[PDB]
Write an enzyme that holds these catalytic residues in place. Structure first.
Site, PDB file in Angstrom:
ATOM      1  N   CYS A 157       5.468   0.207 -15.402  1.00  0.00           N
ATOM      2  CA  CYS A 157       4.923   1.317 -15.952  1.00  0.00           C
ATOM      3  C   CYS A 157       5.562   1.730 -17.225  1.00  0.00           C
ATOM      4  O   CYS A 157       6.746   1.797 -17.470  1.00  0.00           O
ATOM      5  CB  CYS A 157       5.166   2.619 -15.113  1.00  0.00           C
ATOM      6  SG  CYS A 157       3.713   2.414 -13.703  1.00  0.00           S
ATOM      7  N   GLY A 212       7.807  -1.622 -11.760  1.00  0.00           N
ATOM      8  CA  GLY A 212       8.550  -1.542 -12.935  1.00  0.00           C
ATOM      9  C   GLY A 212       7.889  -1.676 -14.391  1.00  0.00           C
ATOM     10  O   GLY A 212       8.478  -1.394 -15.189  1.00  0.00           O
ATOM     11  N   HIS A 232       5.313  10.451 -13.993  1.00  0.00           N
ATOM     12  CA  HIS A 232       5.796  10.136 -12.562  1.00  0.00           C
ATOM     13  C   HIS A 232       7.203   9.661 -12.344  1.00  0.00           C
ATOM     14  O   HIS A 232       7.774   9.731 -11.419  1.00  0.00           O
ATOM     15  CB  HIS A 232       4.750   9.184 -11.845  1.00  0.00           C
ATOM     16  CG  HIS A 232       4.790   7.970 -12.075  1.00  0.00           C
ATOM     17  ND1 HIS A 232       3.870   7.284 -12.965  1.00  0.00           N
ATOM     18  CD2 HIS A 232       5.816   6.971 -11.778  1.00  0.00           C
ATOM     19  CE1 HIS A 232       4.072   5.936 -13.149  1.00  0.00           C
ATOM     20  NE2 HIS A 232       5.073   5.697 -12.310  1.00  0.00           N
TER      21      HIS A 232
HETATM   22  C1  LIG Z   1       4.944   1.823 -12.083  1.00  0.00           C
HETATM   23  O1  LIG Z   1       5.589   0.764 -12.693  1.00  0.00           O
HETATM   24  C2  LIG Z   1       3.838   1.221 -11.352  1.00  0.00           C
HETATM   25  C3  LIG Z   1       3.156  -0.055 -11.721  1.00  0.00           C
HETATM   26  C4  LIG Z   1       2.317  -0.640 -10.489  1.00  0.00           C
HETATM   27  C5  LIG Z   1       3.592  -1.275  -9.339  1.00  0.00           C
HETATM   28  C6  LIG Z   1       2.529  -2.449  -9.195  1.00  0.00           C
HETATM   29  N1  LIG Z   1       1.807  -2.863 -10.061  1.00  0.00           N
HETATM   30  C7  LIG Z   1       1.590  -1.926 -11.152  1.00  0.00           C
HETATM   31  O2  LIG Z   1       0.862  -1.908 -12.022  1.00  0.00           O
HETATM   32  N2  LIG Z   1       2.936   2.277 -10.806  1.00  0.00           N
HETATM   33  C8  LIG Z   1       3.050   2.754  -9.453  1.00  0.00           C
HETATM   34  O3  LIG Z   1       3.525   2.337  -8.564  1.00  0.00           O
HETATM   35  C9  LIG Z   1       1.912   3.728  -9.110  1.00  0.00           C
HETATM   36  C10 LIG Z   1       2.679   5.215  -9.245  1.00  0.00           C
HETATM   37  C11 LIG Z   1       1.632   6.538  -8.856  1.00  0.00           C
HETATM   38  C12 LIG Z   1       2.327   7.889  -9.261  1.00  0.00           C
HETATM   39  C13 LIG Z   1       0.568   6.597 -10.108  1.00  0.00           C
HETATM   40  N3  LIG Z   1       1.222   3.603  -7.807  1.00  0.00           N
HETATM   41  C14 LIG Z   1       0.423   2.650  -7.795  1.00  0.00           C
HETATM   42  O4  LIG Z   1      -0.088   1.671  -8.412  1.00  0.00           O
HETATM   43  O5  LIG Z   1      -0.070   2.748  -6.453  1.00  0.00           O
HETATM   44  C15 LIG Z   1      -1.344   2.233  -6.265  1.00  0.00           C
HETATM   45  C16 LIG Z   1      -2.467   3.084  -5.444  1.00  0.00           C
HETATM   46  C17 LIG Z   1      -2.537   4.540  -6.212  1.00  0.00           C
HETATM   47  C18 LIG Z   1      -1.705   3.393  -3.889  1.00  0.00           C
HETATM   48  S1  LIG Z   1      -4.057   2.101  -5.206  1.00  0.00           S
HETATM   49  O6  LIG Z   1      -4.916   3.169  -4.438  1.00  0.00           O
HETATM   50  C19 LIG Z   1      -3.540   0.832  -4.135  1.00  0.00           C
HETATM   51  C20 LIG Z   1      -4.313   1.181  -2.583  1.00  0.00           C
HETATM   52  C21 LIG Z   1      -3.890  -0.034  -1.785  1.00  0.00           C
HETATM   53  C22 LIG Z   1      -3.268  -1.063  -2.147  1.00  0.00           C
HETATM   54  C23 LIG Z   1      -2.856  -1.303  -3.501  1.00  0.00           C
HETATM   55  C24 LIG Z   1      -3.044  -0.086  -4.459  1.00  0.00           C
END
Ligand SMILES: *[C@H](O)[C@H](C[C@@H]1CCNC1=O)NC(=O)[C@H](CC(C)C)NC(=O)OCC(C)(C)[S@](=O)c1ccccc1
Ligand SMILES: *[C@H](O)[C@H](C[C@@H]1CCNC1=O)NC(=O)[C@H](CC(C)C)NC(=O)OCC(C)(C)[S@](=O)c1ccccc1
Lengths: 306, 306
Positions: free
Chosen positions: B150, B148, B43
């Site tokens: 990931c 950050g 991603h």
């Molecule tokens: C990459 O660095 C990052 C790591 C995350 C950021 C916050 N803590 C972490 O572990 N990954 C992402 O931001 C990731 C990217 C996608 C393209 C995989 N998205 C993410 O983590 O989004 C969270 C969702 C998927 C929206 S989860 O369903 C959610 C829903 C509602 C509230 C919180 C999370």
């Protein structure tokens, strides 16, 4: 709902490159090689059936430079020639003829009750694991150390500077652990001899319980926050009677108060109530107070603020 | 009496030397540099406005080698030239012109629910912390990861071989985390896009609760042990009705049974009773079952058995 808090240690690579094995005759343990000095616990000098009542001054007199063998096993192996030996408190300072080429930027510091540090557990000069602990109010740590672990080191980091604060010495009857600072003093009132020792009463670290309650609020968990407040002075009189350390505020706690909009005094009141019982409720998956996370842990792990 | 159990990670230095920063356009995260290959989450290829439903095959076709910028920051810094790119599942495989001179002996493996692994949390290609987690039965981990993070990696070790098992990808609504194996599959049923996802029910890991009760017995805490036994077959029927994983014994559990003289089936019975309540008592300082320590943890940390 997970709090986002883990027991987080520093990356250990910089310290791994400083660990050596020190052997003195029939005894072996770990040492720390910085510049031209190798630090290790002085009881490497003591025969096994003598650890109960050694004369470290006489033992040191009986040693020569050739009495100590120092080996680096990991990375590029080396055997280090000892050219001087000295005692500082409960540690030996062995001078070697080669400066460690991997010496990091470092200082020596003493850690205080409630503060966290990282430990690199080592056996025979080889790092085997890393974990983090908080120094308890009774100057023990709840560690994980077996025979051969003495000389394992604890440290904090400020930027790239490693602040070494702990060298492992012993395990108490209750399973907790203690050791030396690098000025050679033992933490607390402990002595590095093989005898049963008066070990003092532990307490809850109030500033860390406050940090944990802030971590709960930052996760949306705030059922325990009421308008009621207890002043720091009044909380601290109460703490004396109820096995809590006295609360001393810091800028780290202050940032949590600003972020959450919840005053320290509200959480001091909450602690007084939660100490009487959680009444069937939980906070961040727990039914008891948690004092193993610091204000800096919460700021770093949840808000990314160092 | 402290149990002697801590959250014990592997020493991280061998993996620190493999972390790099990977940037694509205005997106940045971490990668793992082994031989001439850099692994990172795919991603990084996605514009932020498009993370909800990315077309990864089309994004990959649009990239050239020059789309990717890879830097080693720690140790001897380097800018790595990408000379090939490919996608495997949810990971990118970037071929670079320099082989990592610090590549450890390594394999790729997948970790199973209940098993522990070490995580090196990194930001901008720089390691910042290490911690250990168990893979939950719903294929999340209770980690500590911010924006950050990931591309941070998880791994186990056998001897000197690093078994890479996890690349960090996302945080779920309940605060837990998941990621990819290095075959590019996401753990569980998760997908790597910015859409809220059905995250499945978690369970207690029975094999780890058994390990923890053995740790209690090893520490002299055995009030919950009775002559009564529950067979594995009968316990496993009960486990499905009570949000526990089914129990599968291992040689590691077997050595705990031999060391303590307490049969597995006695502890399966104990778990059933303890799950209905501790009755005001504690085990190893806890009023609830603990499933975050493995049989191997207990064998290693308390009995010194790798
Ligand atoms: C990459 O660095 C990052 C790591 C995350 C950021 C916050 N803590 C972490 O572990 N990954 C992402 O931001 C990731 C990217 C996608 C393209 C995989 N998205 C993410 O983590 O989004 C969270 C969702 C998927 C929206 S989860 O369903 C959610 C829903 C509602 C509230 C919180 C999370
Ligand atoms: C050095 O490798 C070793 C580390 C210990 C071994 C077990 N786990 C550890 O952390 N240190 C010692 O064995 C130490 C040597 C002294 C000369 C400092 N002794 C030690 O820890 O003995 C335990 C005591 C001090 C006798 S404690 O009072 C105790 C009494 C009764 C039962 C158990 C413990």
């Amino acid at each position: 709902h997970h709090s986002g808090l883990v027991k987080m240690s520093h990356p250990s690579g910089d310290v791994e490159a400083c660990m050596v094995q020190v052997t003195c005759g029939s005894m072996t343990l770990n040492g720390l090689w910085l510049d031209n000095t190798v630090w290790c616990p002085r009881h490497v000098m003591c025969p096994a059936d003598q650890l109960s009542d050694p004369n470290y001054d006489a033992l040191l007199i009986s040693m020569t430079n050739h009495s100590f063998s120092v080996q680096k096993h990991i990375g590029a192996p080396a055997n280090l020639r000892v050219v001087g030996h000295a005692m500082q408190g409960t540690l030996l300072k062995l001078t070697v003829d080669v400066a460690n080429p991997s010496t990091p930027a470092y200082t020596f510091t003493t850690v205080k009750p409630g503060a966290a540090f990282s430990v690199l557990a080592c056996y025979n000069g080889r790092p085997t694991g890393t974990f983090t602990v908080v120094m308890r109010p009774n100057y023990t740590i709840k560690g994980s150390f077996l025979c051969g672990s003495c000389g394992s080191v604890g440290y904090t980091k400020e930027g790239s500077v490693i602040n070494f604060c702990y060298m492992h010495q012993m395990e108490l009857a209750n399973g907790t652990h203690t050791g030396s600072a690098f000025d050679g003093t033992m933490y607390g009132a402990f002595m590095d001899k093989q005898v049963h020792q008066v070990q003092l009463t532990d307490k809850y670290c109030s500033v860390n319980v406050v940090a944990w309650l802030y971590a709960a609020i930052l996760n949306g968990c705030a059922w325990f926050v009421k308008p009621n407040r207890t002043s720091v002075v009044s909380f601290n009189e109460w703490a004396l009677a109820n096995q809590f350390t006295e609360f001393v505020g810091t800028q780290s706690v202050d940032m949590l108060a600003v972020k959450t909009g919840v005053a320290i005094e509200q959480l001091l009141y909450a602690i007084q109530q939660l100490y009487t019982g959680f009444q069937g409720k939980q906070i961040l998956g727990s039914t008891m107070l948690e004092d193993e996370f610091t204000p800096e842990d919460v700021n770093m792990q949840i808000m990314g603020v160092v």
